[model samples]
Target: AEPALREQQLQQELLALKQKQQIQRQILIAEFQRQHEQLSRQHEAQLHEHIKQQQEMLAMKHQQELLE
Candidate 1:
């Protein structure tokens, strides 16, 4: 049993902890990005739908004017 052996064990433990923390951060960020992308797509679809409905209303009004 030597002092250096104890030091090496602690060093290895610290390295493992650091590696675990890095992996956790990566997973967290990846999940956040996925959520962001999904949310953005949903918002974009809603916006397009709203625009399309407005366009349809305008088209109907123009047709009515023509009929008059």
Candidate 2:
């Protein structure tokens, strides 16, 4: 016939490579979206805890000053 079966593999590989790249891009988009939300929430919680600690430390200092 023409070039036979070996010729078909190269033709098929070009489309397959394009399909894999499209899928990989979509998966990476979803991962970045989800991770941003998770890290944002974690950062807010940590900052709130730090503010509470600072207030408590100031109260402790005031009490020690009164005792002296």
Candidate 3:
């Protein structure tokens, strides 16, 4: 009877630790997702700015050709 009780207690403790680990894992995953989204937005903004600059350069070149 004494050994049985000890085994039961250990099992309960193990279950609690597993639950804690699962919660921590979820938090870390959420943080990583947030960071990924932020970086994606930043990259998109940079691309848009680059395209706008290229368009402006093309317009200027066209004007110069017309003058020539």
Candidate 4:
């Protein structure tokens, strides 16, 4: 009888520990997703600025050719 009670207690503890670990895993995943989205936005903004600069340079070159 004592052994059966001990086993029941162990099972309860194991279930609690599993739930804690699952919650921690979800928090880590959410943090990673947040950082990923932030970096993606930054990268897109940099690409847009680069293209704008390139277009401006092309326009200046075309104007120079017209002057010649």
Candidate 5:
């Protein structure tokens, strides 16, 4: 009877530990996803700014050519 009780206690402890680990893993995953989304948005914004600058430069060159 004593050995059985000890075994049961150990099993319960293991289950609790597993549950804790799972919760921690979920939190980490959520944080990672949030960071990834933020970075993606930043990259997109940079690309848009670059394109706008290029278009303005092109327009300036065209105006200079017309003046010449």
Candidate 6:
């Protein structure tokens, strides 16, 4: 009877440990998603800046040709 009680206690502990691990995993995943979104936004902004610079350069060249 004592061994059976011990086994039951261990089982309960295992269940609690599993629950705790699952919660931690979810938190880590959410953090990762948040970081990923932030990086993506930064990348998009940089690309937009690059394209804008290129368009300005092209417009300047066209104006130079008209002046010539």
**lDDT (0-100) at residue 4 of candidate 4?**
98
Instruction: Please write out the lDDT profile of model 2 over residues 30-56, one tens digit for every residue.
Output: 899899999999999899999999888
For every candidate in turn, the CA RMSD to the true structure comes to 1.6, 3.7, 2.4, 2.3, 2.0, 2.1
Considering summed lDDT, which 10 consecutive residues are worst modelled in model 6?
59-68
TM-score against truth, every candidate: 0.84, 0.53, 0.73, 0.75, 0.75, 0.76
TM-score result, candidate 6? 0.76
Best-performing candidate as measured by TM-score: 1
lDDT of each: 0.96, 0.90, 0.95, 0.95, 0.95, 0.96
Please give, for residues 3-53, the per-residue lDDT of candidate 6 as tens digits: 999999999999999999999999999999999999999999999999999
Error of 1 at 6 (Å): 3.3
lDDT of 1 by residue, 1-68 (tens): 78999999999999999999999999999999999999999999999999999898998889788996
Give the distance in Å from residue 67's predicted Cα in candidate 4 to where it truly belongs. Answer: 3.4
Ranking by TM-score: 1, 6, 5, 4, 3, 2
lDDT of 3 by residue, 1-68 (tens): 89999999999999999999999999999999999999999999999999999988998889787996
Cα-lDDT of candidate 1: 0.96
Candidate 2 deviant stretches above 4 angstroms: 2-4, 47-68
> Which candidate, 5 or 6, would have the higher TM-score against the true structure?
6
Q: How far in Å is the alpha carbon of 18 misplaced in model 1? A: 0.7
Residue 23 of model 2 has an lDDT of 91
Clashing residue pairs in candidate 1 are: none
Give the per-residue lDDT digits (tens) of candidate 4, residues 1-68.
Answer: 89999999999999999999999999999999999999999999999999999888998889787996
Relative to the true structure, candidate 2 reaches a TM of 0.53
